[PDB]
Design a protein around this motif. Sequence first.
Motif, PDB file in Angstrom:
ATOM      1  N   UNK A   1     -10.216  17.007 -14.843  1.00 48.08           N
ATOM      2  CA  UNK A   1     -10.131  15.630 -14.360  1.00 48.08           C
ATOM      3  C   UNK A   1      -9.051  15.525 -13.284  1.00 48.08           C
ATOM      4  N   UNK A   2      -9.467  15.363 -12.030  1.00 48.74           N
ATOM      5  CA  UNK A   2      -8.532  15.086 -10.948  1.00 48.74           C
ATOM      6  C   UNK A   2      -8.237  13.592 -10.880  1.00 48.74           C
ATOM      7  N   UNK A   3      -7.033  13.262 -10.406  1.00 49.06           N
ATOM      8  CA  UNK A   3      -6.579  11.873 -10.419  1.00 49.06           C
ATOM      9  C   UNK A   3      -7.470  10.969  -9.576  1.00 49.06           C
ATOM     10  N   UNK A   4      -7.997  11.479  -8.459  1.00 46.46           N
ATOM     11  CA  UNK A   4      -8.758  10.639  -7.535  1.00 46.46           C
ATOM     12  C   UNK A   4      -9.998  10.054  -8.202  1.00 46.46           C
ATOM     13  N   UNK A   5     -10.856  10.911  -8.762  1.00 42.64           N
ATOM     14  CA  UNK A   5     -12.108  10.422  -9.330  1.00 42.64           C
ATOM     15  C   UNK A   5     -11.885   9.668 -10.634  1.00 42.64           C
ATOM     16  N   UNK A   6     -10.836  10.013 -11.380  1.00 43.29           N
ATOM     17  CA  UNK A   6     -10.492   9.231 -12.562  1.00 43.29           C
ATOM     18  C   UNK A   6     -10.114   7.814 -12.158  1.00 43.29           C
ATOM     19  N   UNK A   7      -9.282   7.675 -11.114  1.00 47.12           N
ATOM     20  CA  UNK A   7      -8.913   6.345 -10.624  1.00 47.12           C
ATOM     21  C   UNK A   7     -10.130   5.621 -10.065  1.00 47.12           C
ATOM     22  N   UNK A   8     -11.059   6.363  -9.460  1.00 43.95           N
ATOM     23  CA  UNK A   8     -12.291   5.750  -8.964  1.00 43.95           C
ATOM     24  C   UNK A   8     -13.110   5.146 -10.105  1.00 43.95           C
ATOM     25  N   UNK A   9     -13.352   5.932 -11.157  1.00 46.54           N
ATOM     26  CA  UNK A   9     -14.102   5.405 -12.294  1.00 46.54           C
ATOM     27  C   UNK A   9     -13.346   4.273 -12.969  1.00 46.54           C
ATOM     28  N   UNK A  10     -12.014   4.359 -13.011  1.00 52.69           N
ATOM     29  CA  UNK A  10     -11.241   3.259 -13.572  1.00 52.69           C
ATOM     30  C   UNK A  10     -11.421   1.993 -12.749  1.00 52.69           C
ATOM     31  N   UNK A  11     -11.456   2.125 -11.419  1.00 56.30           N
ATOM     32  CA  UNK A  11     -11.738   0.985 -10.544  1.00 56.30           C
ATOM     33  C   UNK A  11     -13.070   0.351 -10.897  1.00 56.30           C
ATOM     34  N   UNK A  12     -14.098   1.188 -11.036  1.00 56.37           N
ATOM     35  CA  UNK A  12     -15.419   0.682 -11.403  1.00 56.37           C
ATOM     36  C   UNK A  12     -15.354  -0.048 -12.738  1.00 56.37           C
ATOM     37  N   UNK A  13     -14.671   0.547 -13.721  1.00 58.46           N
ATOM     38  CA  UNK A  13     -14.547  -0.077 -15.035  1.00 58.46           C
ATOM     39  C   UNK A  13     -13.780  -1.390 -14.958  1.00 58.46           C
ATOM     40  N   UNK A  14     -12.778  -1.462 -14.080  1.00 54.97           N
ATOM     41  CA  UNK A  14     -11.989  -2.677 -13.923  1.00 54.97           C
ATOM     42  C   UNK A  14     -12.842  -3.787 -13.330  1.00 54.97           C
ATOM     43  N   UNK A  15     -13.628  -3.463 -12.302  1.00 52.94           N
ATOM     44  CA  UNK A  15     -14.544  -4.447 -11.727  1.00 52.94           C
ATOM     45  C   UNK A  15     -15.578  -4.903 -12.750  1.00 52.94           C
ATOM     46  N   UNK A  16     -16.081  -3.975 -13.569  1.00 54.04           N
ATOM     47  CA  UNK A  16     -17.041  -4.355 -14.603  1.00 54.04           C
ATOM     48  C   UNK A  16     -16.413  -5.272 -15.643  1.00 54.04           C
ATOM     49  N   UNK A  17     -15.107  -5.148 -15.867  1.00 53.25           N
ATOM     50  CA  UNK A  17     -14.422  -5.893 -16.912  1.00 53.25           C
ATOM     51  C   UNK A  17     -13.896  -7.235 -16.430  1.00 53.25           C
ATOM     52  N   UNK A  18     -14.243  -7.645 -15.208  1.00 58.51           N
ATOM     53  CA  UNK A  18     -13.824  -8.943 -14.699  1.00 58.51           C
ATOM     54  C   UNK A  18     -14.298 -10.058 -15.623  1.00 58.51           C
ATOM     55  N   UNK A  19     -13.365 -10.951 -15.953  1.00 59.54           N
ATOM     56  CA  UNK A  19     -13.635 -12.055 -16.864  1.00 59.54           C
ATOM     57  C   UNK A  19     -14.691 -13.008 -16.315  1.00 59.54           C
ATOM     58  N   UNK A  20     -14.739 -13.188 -14.997  1.00 65.37           N
ATOM     59  CA  UNK A  20     -15.689 -14.108 -14.373  1.00 65.37           C
ATOM     60  C   UNK A  20     -16.988 -13.360 -14.096  1.00 65.37           C
ATOM     61  N   UNK A  21     -18.040 -13.722 -14.837  1.00 66.13           N
ATOM     62  CA  UNK A  21     -19.283 -12.955 -14.836  1.00 66.13           C
ATOM     63  C   UNK A  21     -19.863 -12.785 -13.433  1.00 66.13           C
ATOM     64  N   UNK A  22     -19.735 -13.804 -12.582  1.00 72.37           N
ATOM     65  CA  UNK A  22     -20.276 -13.709 -11.232  1.00 72.37           C
ATOM     66  C   UNK A  22     -19.431 -12.837 -10.322  1.00 72.37           C
ATOM     67  N   UNK A  23     -18.218 -12.488 -10.739  1.00 73.49           N
ATOM     68  CA  UNK A  23     -17.339 -11.614  -9.974  1.00 73.49           C
ATOM     69  C   UNK A  23     -17.491 -10.149 -10.353  1.00 73.49           C
ATOM     70  N   UNK A  24     -18.331  -9.831 -11.342  1.00 74.77           N
ATOM     71  CA  UNK A  24     -18.625  -8.444 -11.655  1.00 74.77           C
ATOM     72  C   UNK A  24     -19.730  -7.923 -10.739  1.00 74.77           C
ATOM     73  N   UNK A  25     -19.694  -6.640 -10.386  1.00 70.91           N
ATOM     74  CA  UNK A  25     -20.810  -6.059  -9.639  1.00 70.91           C
ATOM     75  C   UNK A  25     -22.069  -6.046 -10.486  1.00 70.91           C
ATOM     76  N   UNK A  26     -23.207  -5.982  -9.805  1.00 71.45           N
ATOM     77  CA  UNK A  26     -24.458  -5.790 -10.514  1.00 71.45           C
ATOM     78  C   UNK A  26     -24.660  -4.294 -10.736  1.00 71.45           C
ATOM     79  N   UNK A  27     -25.716  -3.941 -11.470  1.00 73.19           N
ATOM     80  CA  UNK A  27     -25.861  -2.555 -11.904  1.00 73.19           C
ATOM     81  C   UNK A  27     -26.032  -1.619 -10.713  1.00 73.19           C
ATOM     82  N   UNK A  28     -26.699  -2.073  -9.646  1.00 70.79           N
ATOM     83  CA  UNK A  28     -26.923  -1.200  -8.495  1.00 70.79           C
ATOM     84  C   UNK A  28     -25.619  -0.895  -7.768  1.00 70.79           C
ATOM     85  N   UNK A  29     -24.734  -1.891  -7.652  1.00 66.81           N
ATOM     86  CA  UNK A  29     -23.417  -1.643  -7.076  1.00 66.81           C
ATOM     87  C   UNK A  29     -22.639  -0.636  -7.913  1.00 66.81           C
TER      88      UNK A  29
END
Lengths: 276, 274
Positions: free
Chosen positions: B236-264
């Motif tokens: 696990x390199x730091x770059x791609x781990x931080x990338x997936x964490x970014x994706x997980x953070x966007x998915x975890x947005x409290x405001x449902x309309x502010x989360x990406x859709x599945x294709x994003x």
Amino acid sequence: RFHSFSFYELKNVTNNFDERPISVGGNKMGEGGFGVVYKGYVNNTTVAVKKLAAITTEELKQQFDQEIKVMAKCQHENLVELLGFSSDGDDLCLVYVYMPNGSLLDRLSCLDGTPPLSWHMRCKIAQGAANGINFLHENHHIHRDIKSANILLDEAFTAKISDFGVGTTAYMAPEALRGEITPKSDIYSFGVVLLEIITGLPAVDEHREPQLLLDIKEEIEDEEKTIEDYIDKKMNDADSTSVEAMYSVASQCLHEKKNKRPDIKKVQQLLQEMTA
Amino acid sequence: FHSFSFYELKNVTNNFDERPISVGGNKMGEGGFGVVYKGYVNNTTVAVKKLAAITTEELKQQFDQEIKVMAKCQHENLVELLGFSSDGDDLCLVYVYMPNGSLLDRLSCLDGTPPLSWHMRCKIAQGAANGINFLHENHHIHRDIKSANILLDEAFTAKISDFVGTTAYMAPEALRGEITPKSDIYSFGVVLLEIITGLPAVDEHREPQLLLDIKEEIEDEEKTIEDYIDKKMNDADSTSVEAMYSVASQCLHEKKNKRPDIKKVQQLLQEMTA
Ligand SMILES: Cc1ccc(C(=O)Nc2ccc(CN3CCN(C)CC3)c(C(F)(F)F)c2)cc1C#Cc1cnc2cccnn12
Ligand SMILES: Cc1ccc(C(=O)Nc2ccc(CN3CCN(C)CC3)c(C(F)(F)F)c2)cc1C#Cc1cnc2cccnn12
Ligand SMILES: [Co+2]
Ligand SMILES: [Co+2]
Ligand SMILES: [Co+2]
Ligand SMILES: [Co+2]
């Protein structure tokens, strides 16, 4: 007894004491204890080379001679070995035989993706660490810092007790926290180590309840829990009988009252009857 | 699909032996309104859910609804329904057995299986995302997305399954009764945190108890994502781990309309692989 190394051989063999981590291909594997430790290869052996740095350059020496003094006496299958040293020019160096499977702590946590230790192997490692402690006790040594990070493992996964530079509070017996110096404290810390072997959990986790692994003893005694609830799920070969046997040993070792704990020969016997 | 006689699945499951598999029985687990058994028939190792008692004909309606949805949901990344049995009693659903179990069990290295590498975890994330994307294109909401519902075959290919919701995975609006695919996205973000950390979604004896709360700690800079990375990987390199964490953070947005859709999310995991 010891091979007398020259500082310049040790310098050449560590690649001029390359400070980059081994994960990158350098020679630096660790730091602390008034020295940096480097992987090297001398006398047909991979070795660990501790180069001491500079507080009071004479107390360094004091520690240097003390380690050699104690290590000369301590030679056992289940102890780490001091190959030699260098009192030579520039720095002081200590050379130990390298154990390629690292500490029991790292393997219990499966650090770097190493496969989980089986129950059979765990039992043998407990027996071996018990034997090394027994050697230390028979010859009137107190370890004073028994913990899973001070148990190394060689090519064959045999336990090698080590002491890297008053103790570690998560492993400390109550009387040792109050300043007493006794082998019974070693037995207590070893009981904690056995809990680590059974559960796969670290001794202290600030973000866990309980924070201290030893406290699970209470939870099992007050019957809020059982040992089965804490068994490491990363083994498929663990039978209830011998797991409970090791837990019994660990529990006896963890008695608050130092004179009710078994001595190391008793532990040895119980761990023997565990796999017999 | 194949119509089975009930006595066939009775023969093939050892008469629905309810002892767990570790004892030598056939019971794989408890799911929905039935019990899941391991069996073998027609050159296929199978999982058989036998449904039990709840109004009986609503049982039949759920049975029929599952067959109807799964009949036209055939995808590389979804569980494959092989057949069923409706003669008399009971109702049985037959799926293709996944020999590497669930992502939850493999992340916890259950029974001493080796830990999944970072690369394998990334490909599993991508595959699960593809399965969700298939569901969402066909106007299906999963409503229970969790690591226990992501199965794995011999090649460790992710297969989404289902057997309301799991409170450790639920979005706030899903807890208040809303039904939206954006909730699925939130739950997937939890799954991504699991993949990064090896930690279960809820631990009663842990601070915090909900893995999703680590986001707060990271955003409140009491901590970093590197503090949480599973120690049981060497790749696990730091770059791609931080990338997936970014994706997980966007998915975890409290405001449902502010989360990406599945294709994003698919695009982001894609770019993470490079
Ligand atoms: C650098 C280093 C320094 C010191 C020691 C060391 O263990 N010294 C030691 C000192 C005293 C004692 C006995 N006394 C304890 C105190 N007590 C008051 C009296 C009795 C014992 C004991 F083993 F016997 F226990 C050991 C080991 C190493 C190592 C190493 C090494 C080898 N392979 C690897 C691979 C990875 C990391 N390290 N590493
Ligand atoms: C026995 C069984 C029964 C059912 C299902 C199942 O997943 N059915 C399912 C039903 C519906 C939907 C669609 N969603 C539409 C929207 N609806 C709101 C939710 C539902 C989906 C979905 F895959 F598409 F997701 C799946 C799986 C198994 C299994 C199995 C199995 C095979 N190998 C192993 C190995 C270990 C554990 N299990 N296991
Ligand atoms: Co904290
Ligand atoms: Co047929
Ligand atoms: Co790569
Ligand atoms: Co509790």
